[PDB]
Design a protein around this ligand. Structure first.
Ligand SMILES: [Cl-]
Lengths: 45, 45, 45
């Protein structure tokens, strides 16, 4: 039961890395969308 | 101690699945916002 | 090996909370971008 536990922990850590990488990508795209909205605002105003 | 650990793993995995679900929803809305910005850009240009 | 597991669990939980908090911040910004897009739509149309 300790080895199974260790394996499940390694899997959780692996998925946590995936999650952190996805959050980083989402933040970069979100920043681009903010910039794009601000550009459009300037062009409209 | 090993039953407490096993139970805490199951809880962590549950929370991780909630997080994954929430990220999927965020990504879908973010994609819609990208489409909406692109439509505005094309309209104005 | 149970103590090392318990310490890894604490670290995983620590990170999971940070991830949850970051998702909450992303959601707040994404709500503001949706609002900003709708404002531009209304003005253009
Ligand atoms: Cl997580």
């Amino acid at each position: 039961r300790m080895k199974q536990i260790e394996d499940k922990i390694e899997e959780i850590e692996s998925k946590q890395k995936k999650i952190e990488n996805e959050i980083a990508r989402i933040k970069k795209l979100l920043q681009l969308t903010v910039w794009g909205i601000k550009q459009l605002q300037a062009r409209i105003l």
